[PDB]
Amino acid sequence: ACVFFCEDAAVIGLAV
Amino acid sequence: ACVFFCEDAAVIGLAV
Amino acid sequence: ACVFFCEDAAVIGLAV
Amino acid sequence: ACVFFCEDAAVIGLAV
């Protein structure tokens, strides 16, 4: 998987 | 203390 | 898990 | 060795 830095606010690295 | 990047998913800084 | 930044040299992330 | 990000304040990487 990968880590993306996204927001939907808190900007979090999401392991996806 | 130290900051570690962990996930249990959001990868967040953990202050230990 | 967590990500550590260590060299084995090249320095790289390691998921533990 | 590994790099850790710690503070005792300055937050600095430590080469251990």
PDB file of N, CA and C in Angstrom:
ATOM      1  N   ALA A   1       0.828  -1.191   0.000  1.00  0.00           N
ATOM      2  CA  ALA A   1       0.000   0.000   0.000  1.00  0.00           C
ATOM      3  C   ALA A   1       0.880   1.265   0.000  1.00  0.00           C
ATOM      4  N   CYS A   2       0.192   2.440  -0.123  1.00  0.00           N
ATOM      5  CA  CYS A   2       0.887   3.710  -0.170  1.00  0.00           C
ATOM      6  C   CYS A   2       0.344   4.680   0.860  1.00  0.00           C
ATOM      7  N   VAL A   3       1.094   5.755   1.094  1.00  0.00           N
ATOM      8  CA  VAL A   3       0.678   6.820   1.996  1.00  0.00           C
ATOM      9  C   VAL A   3       0.388   8.053   1.160  1.00  0.00           C
ATOM     10  N   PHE A   4      -0.846   8.553   1.266  1.00  0.00           N
ATOM     11  CA  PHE A   4      -1.259   9.778   0.606  1.00  0.00           C
ATOM     12  C   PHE A   4      -1.596  10.841   1.625  1.00  0.00           C
ATOM     13  N   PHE A   5      -1.229  12.089   1.349  1.00  0.00           N
ATOM     14  CA  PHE A   5      -1.562  13.162   2.272  1.00  0.00           C
ATOM     15  C   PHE A   5      -2.788  13.966   1.778  1.00  0.00           C
ATOM     16  N   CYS A   6      -3.950  13.702   2.384  1.00  0.00           N
ATOM     17  CA  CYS A   6      -5.213  14.259   1.916  1.00  0.00           C
ATOM     18  C   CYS A   6      -6.016  14.921   3.035  1.00  0.00           C
ATOM     19  N   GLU A   7      -7.020  15.702   2.635  1.00  0.00           N
ATOM     20  CA  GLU A   7      -7.897  16.404   3.560  1.00  0.00           C
ATOM     21  C   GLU A   7      -9.337  16.290   3.080  1.00  0.00           C
ATOM     22  N   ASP A   8     -10.268  16.315   4.030  1.00  0.00           N
ATOM     23  CA  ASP A   8     -11.689  16.253   3.702  1.00  0.00           C
ATOM     24  C   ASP A   8     -12.520  17.144   4.627  1.00  0.00           C
ATOM     25  N   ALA A   9      -9.539  21.751   7.880  1.00  0.00           N
ATOM     26  CA  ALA A   9      -9.659  20.312   8.145  1.00  0.00           C
ATOM     27  C   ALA A   9      -8.256  19.692   8.342  1.00  0.00           C
ATOM     28  N   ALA A  10      -8.229  18.463   8.945  1.00  0.00           N
ATOM     29  CA  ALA A  10      -6.978  17.770   9.199  1.00  0.00           C
ATOM     30  C   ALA A  10      -6.385  17.166   7.927  1.00  0.00           C
ATOM     31  N   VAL A  11      -5.078  17.344   7.760  1.00  0.00           N
ATOM     32  CA  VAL A  11      -4.350  16.806   6.621  1.00  0.00           C
ATOM     33  C   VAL A  11      -3.541  15.621   7.129  1.00  0.00           C
ATOM     34  N   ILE A  12      -3.934  14.417   6.746  1.00  0.00           N
ATOM     35  CA  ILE A  12      -3.372  13.220   7.348  1.00  0.00           C
ATOM     36  C   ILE A  12      -2.766  12.339   6.265  1.00  0.00           C
ATOM     37  N   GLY A  13      -1.652  11.708   6.610  1.00  0.00           N
ATOM     38  CA  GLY A  13      -1.128  10.630   5.803  1.00  0.00           C
ATOM     39  C   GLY A  13      -2.019   9.432   5.980  1.00  0.00           C
ATOM     40  N   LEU A  14      -2.623   8.968   4.899  1.00  0.00           N
ATOM     41  CA  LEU A  14      -3.510   7.825   4.946  1.00  0.00           C
ATOM     42  C   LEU A  14      -2.881   6.634   4.244  1.00  0.00           C
ATOM     43  N   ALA A  15      -2.716   5.535   4.979  1.00  0.00           N
ATOM     44  CA  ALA A  15      -2.318   4.404   4.450  1.00  0.00           C
ATOM     45  C   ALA A  15      -3.332   3.882   3.736  1.00  0.00           C
ATOM     46  N   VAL A  16      -3.117   3.675   2.444  1.00  0.00           N
ATOM     47  CA  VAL A  16      -4.113   3.151   1.524  1.00  0.00           C
ATOM     48  C   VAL A  16      -3.502   2.057   0.684  1.00  0.00           C
TER      49      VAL A  16
ATOM     50  N   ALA B   1      10.762  13.710  24.945  1.00  0.00           N
ATOM     51  CA  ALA B   1      10.204  12.509  24.276  1.00  0.00           C
ATOM     52  C   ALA B   1      10.474  12.526  22.765  1.00  0.00           C
ATOM     53  N   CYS B   2      10.058  11.407  22.087  1.00  0.00           N
ATOM     54  CA  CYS B   2      10.238  11.275  20.652  1.00  0.00           C
ATOM     55  C   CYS B   2       8.895  11.131  19.944  1.00  0.00           C
ATOM     56  N   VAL B   3       8.885  11.494  18.666  1.00  0.00           N
ATOM     57  CA  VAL B   3       7.704  11.419  17.819  1.00  0.00           C
ATOM     58  C   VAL B   3       7.904  10.305  16.808  1.00  0.00           C
ATOM     59  N   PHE B   4       6.957   9.379  16.762  1.00  0.00           N
ATOM     60  CA  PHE B   4       7.016   8.258  15.838  1.00  0.00           C
ATOM     61  C   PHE B   4       5.801   8.287  14.926  1.00  0.00           C
ATOM     62  N   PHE B   5       5.959   7.830  13.687  1.00  0.00           N
ATOM     63  CA  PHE B   5       4.839   7.818  12.771  1.00  0.00           C
ATOM     64  C   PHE B   5       4.218   6.399  12.667  1.00  0.00           C
ATOM     65  N   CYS B   6       2.987   6.269  13.164  1.00  0.00           N
ATOM     66  CA  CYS B   6       2.348   4.967  13.290  1.00  0.00           C
ATOM     67  C   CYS B   6       0.886   4.986  12.835  1.00  0.00           C
ATOM     68  N   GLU B   7       0.338   3.812  12.534  1.00  0.00           N
ATOM     69  CA  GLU B   7      -1.049   3.689  12.120  1.00  0.00           C
ATOM     70  C   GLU B   7      -1.615   2.390  12.659  1.00  0.00           C
ATOM     71  N   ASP B   8      -2.903   2.418  12.977  1.00  0.00           N
ATOM     72  CA  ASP B   8      -3.583   1.252  13.512  1.00  0.00           C
ATOM     73  C   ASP B   8      -4.830   0.956  12.697  1.00  0.00           C
ATOM     74  N   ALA B   9      -5.545   3.247   6.944  1.00  0.00           N
ATOM     75  CA  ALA B   9      -5.606   3.847   8.319  1.00  0.00           C
ATOM     76  C   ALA B   9      -4.738   5.119   8.377  1.00  0.00           C
ATOM     77  N   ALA B  10      -5.076   6.053   9.325  1.00  0.00           N
ATOM     78  CA  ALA B  10      -4.301   7.286   9.435  1.00  0.00           C
ATOM     79  C   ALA B  10      -2.917   7.010  10.026  1.00  0.00           C
ATOM     80  N   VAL B  11      -1.887   7.578   9.399  1.00  0.00           N
ATOM     81  CA  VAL B  11      -0.509   7.506   9.884  1.00  0.00           C
ATOM     82  C   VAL B  11      -0.241   8.800  10.637  1.00  0.00           C
ATOM     83  N   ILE B  12      -0.131   8.720  11.959  1.00  0.00           N
ATOM     84  CA  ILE B  12      -0.085   9.912  12.792  1.00  0.00           C
ATOM     85  C   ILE B  12       1.208   9.931  13.588  1.00  0.00           C
ATOM     86  N   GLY B  13       1.565  11.126  14.049  1.00  0.00           N
ATOM     87  CA  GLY B  13       2.710  11.259  14.927  1.00  0.00           C
ATOM     88  C   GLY B  13       2.310  10.837  16.318  1.00  0.00           C
ATOM     89  N   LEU B  14       3.136  10.008  16.935  1.00  0.00           N
ATOM     90  CA  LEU B  14       2.885   9.572  18.307  1.00  0.00           C
ATOM     91  C   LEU B  14       3.999  10.073  19.220  1.00  0.00           C
ATOM     92  N   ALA B  15       3.642  10.746  20.319  1.00  0.00           N
ATOM     93  CA  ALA B  15       4.547  11.243  21.127  1.00  0.00           C
ATOM     94  C   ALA B  15       4.802  10.416  22.163  1.00  0.00           C
ATOM     95  N   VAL B  16       5.976   9.790  22.178  1.00  0.00           N
ATOM     96  CA  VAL B  16       6.377   8.838  23.220  1.00  0.00           C
ATOM     97  C   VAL B  16       7.490   9.363  24.127  1.00  0.00           C
TER      98      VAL B  16
ATOM     99  N   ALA C   1       1.061  -0.468  12.651  1.00  0.00           N
ATOM    100  CA  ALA C   1       2.576  -0.448  12.758  1.00  0.00           C
ATOM    101  C   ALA C   1       3.124   0.986  12.664  1.00  0.00           C
ATOM    102  N   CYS C   2       4.491   1.099  12.762  1.00  0.00           N
ATOM    103  CA  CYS C   2       5.176   2.383  12.695  1.00  0.00           C
ATOM    104  C   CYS C   2       6.190   2.376  11.554  1.00  0.00           C
ATOM    105  N   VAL C   3       6.690   3.558  11.183  1.00  0.00           N
ATOM    106  CA  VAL C   3       7.737   3.700  10.170  1.00  0.00           C
ATOM    107  C   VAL C   3       8.992   4.229  10.848  1.00  0.00           C
ATOM    108  N   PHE C   4      10.104   3.529  10.651  1.00  0.00           N
ATOM    109  CA  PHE C   4      11.375   3.978  11.193  1.00  0.00           C
ATOM    110  C   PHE C   4      12.325   4.385  10.062  1.00  0.00           C
ATOM    111  N   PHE C   5      13.209   5.336  10.336  1.00  0.00           N
ATOM    112  CA  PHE C   5      14.114   5.801   9.302  1.00  0.00           C
ATOM    113  C   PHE C   5      15.567   5.437   9.680  1.00  0.00           C
ATOM    114  N   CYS C   6      16.054   4.403   9.002  1.00  0.00           N
ATOM    115  CA  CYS C   6      17.326   3.768   9.331  1.00  0.00           C
ATOM    116  C   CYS C   6      18.110   3.494   8.053  1.00  0.00           C
ATOM    117  N   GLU C   7      19.421   3.361   8.173  1.00  0.00           N
ATOM    118  CA  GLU C   7      20.275   2.999   7.054  1.00  0.00           C
ATOM    119  C   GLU C   7      20.765   1.571   7.223  1.00  0.00           C
ATOM    120  N   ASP C   8      20.812   0.833   6.118  1.00  0.00           N
ATOM    121  CA  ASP C   8      21.368  -0.519   6.107  1.00  0.00           C
ATOM    122  C   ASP C   8      22.448  -0.611   5.035  1.00  0.00           C
ATOM    123  N   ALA C   9      25.514   3.805   4.058  1.00  0.00           N
ATOM    124  CA  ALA C   9      24.533   3.082   3.199  1.00  0.00           C
ATOM    125  C   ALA C   9      23.274   3.955   2.973  1.00  0.00           C
ATOM    126  N   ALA C  10      22.273   3.374   2.237  1.00  0.00           N
ATOM    127  CA  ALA C  10      21.028   4.080   1.964  1.00  0.00           C
ATOM    128  C   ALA C  10      20.158   4.160   3.225  1.00  0.00           C
ATOM    129  N   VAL C  11      19.576   5.339   3.442  1.00  0.00           N
ATOM    130  CA  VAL C  11      18.646   5.583   4.535  1.00  0.00           C
ATOM    131  C   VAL C  11      17.237   5.440   3.985  1.00  0.00           C
ATOM    132  N   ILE C  12      16.417   4.616   4.633  1.00  0.00           N
ATOM    133  CA  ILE C  12      15.106   4.280   4.091  1.00  0.00           C
ATOM    134  C   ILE C  12      14.117   4.071   5.224  1.00  0.00           C
ATOM    135  N   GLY C  13      12.844   4.182   4.880  1.00  0.00           N
ATOM    136  CA  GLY C  13      11.810   3.886   5.837  1.00  0.00           C
ATOM    137  C   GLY C  13      11.627   2.391   5.982  1.00  0.00           C
ATOM    138  N   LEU C  14      11.293   1.979   7.198  1.00  0.00           N
ATOM    139  CA  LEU C  14      11.048   0.583   7.481  1.00  0.00           C
ATOM    140  C   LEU C  14       9.798   0.429   8.350  1.00  0.00           C
ATOM    141  N   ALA C  15       8.829  -0.348   7.866  1.00  0.00           N
ATOM    142  CA  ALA C  15       7.708  -0.553   8.529  1.00  0.00           C
ATOM    143  C   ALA C  15       7.795  -1.576   9.392  1.00  0.00           C
ATOM    144  N   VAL C  16       7.488  -1.350  10.664  1.00  0.00           N
ATOM    145  CA  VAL C  16       7.549  -2.381  11.694  1.00  0.00           C
ATOM    146  C   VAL C  16       6.222  -2.499  12.434  1.00  0.00           C
TER     147      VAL C  16
ATOM    148  N   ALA D   1      22.669   2.678  11.450  1.00  0.00           N
ATOM    149  CA  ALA D   1      21.986   3.327  12.539  1.00  0.00           C
ATOM    150  C   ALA D   1      20.614   3.875  12.076  1.00  0.00           C
ATOM    151  N   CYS D   2      19.811   4.386  13.067  1.00  0.00           N
ATOM    152  CA  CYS D   2      18.487   4.929  12.785  1.00  0.00           C
ATOM    153  C   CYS D   2      18.444   6.397  13.175  1.00  0.00           C
ATOM    154  N   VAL D   3      17.549   7.162  12.543  1.00  0.00           N
ATOM    155  CA  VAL D   3      17.300   8.553  12.906  1.00  0.00           C
ATOM    156  C   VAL D   3      15.969   8.634  13.655  1.00  0.00           C
ATOM    157  N   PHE D   4      16.005   9.184  14.865  1.00  0.00           N
ATOM    158  CA  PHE D   4      14.800   9.390  15.664  1.00  0.00           C
ATOM    159  C   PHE D   4      14.549  10.888  15.870  1.00  0.00           C
ATOM    160  N   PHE D   5      13.285  11.315  15.949  1.00  0.00           N
ATOM    161  CA  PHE D   5      12.972  12.726  16.166  1.00  0.00           C
ATOM    162  C   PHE D   5      12.473  12.987  17.617  1.00  0.00           C
ATOM    163  N   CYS D   6      13.333  13.589  18.435  1.00  0.00           N
ATOM    164  CA  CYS D   6      13.124  13.710  19.878  1.00  0.00           C
ATOM    165  C   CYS D   6      13.367  15.120  20.385  1.00  0.00           C
ATOM    166  N   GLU D   7      12.791  15.414  21.546  1.00  0.00           N
ATOM    167  CA  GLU D   7      12.963  16.705  22.192  1.00  0.00           C
ATOM    168  C   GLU D   7      13.063  16.501  23.689  1.00  0.00           C
ATOM    169  N   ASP D   8      13.917  17.296  24.322  1.00  0.00           N
ATOM    170  CA  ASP D   8      14.028  17.309  25.774  1.00  0.00           C
ATOM    171  C   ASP D   8      13.746  18.721  26.295  1.00  0.00           C
ATOM    172  N   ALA D   9      11.217  23.837  23.611  1.00  0.00           N
ATOM    173  CA  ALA D   9      12.293  22.835  23.430  1.00  0.00           C
ATOM    174  C   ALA D   9      12.459  22.459  21.946  1.00  0.00           C
ATOM    175  N   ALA D  10      13.753  22.223  21.558  1.00  0.00           N
ATOM    176  CA  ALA D  10      14.089  21.843  20.196  1.00  0.00           C
ATOM    177  C   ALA D  10      13.688  20.402  19.949  1.00  0.00           C
ATOM    178  N   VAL D  11      13.124  20.173  18.772  1.00  0.00           N
ATOM    179  CA  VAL D  11      12.869  18.840  18.248  1.00  0.00           C
ATOM    180  C   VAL D  11      13.922  18.581  17.179  1.00  0.00           C
ATOM    181  N   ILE D  12      14.798  17.611  17.419  1.00  0.00           N
ATOM    182  CA  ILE D  12      15.901  17.345  16.508  1.00  0.00           C
ATOM    183  C   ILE D  12      15.972  15.863  16.188  1.00  0.00           C
ATOM    184  N   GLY D  13      16.376  15.560  14.962  1.00  0.00           N
ATOM    185  CA  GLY D  13      16.695  14.191  14.625  1.00  0.00           C
ATOM    186  C   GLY D  13      17.961  13.745  15.335  1.00  0.00           C
ATOM    187  N   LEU D  14      17.920  12.535  15.874  1.00  0.00           N
ATOM    188  CA  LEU D  14      19.099  11.933  16.479  1.00  0.00           C
ATOM    189  C   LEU D  14      19.577  10.736  15.646  1.00  0.00           C
ATOM    190  N   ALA D  15      20.863  10.718  15.277  1.00  0.00           N
ATOM    191  CA  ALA D  15      21.400   9.652  14.716  1.00  0.00           C
ATOM    192  C   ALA D  15      21.823   8.722  15.622  1.00  0.00           C
ATOM    193  N   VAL D  16      21.122   7.603  15.735  1.00  0.00           N
ATOM    194  CA  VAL D  16      21.603   6.654  16.744  1.00  0.00           C
ATOM    195  C   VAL D  16      22.260   5.486  16.044  1.00  0.00           C
TER     196      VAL D  16
END
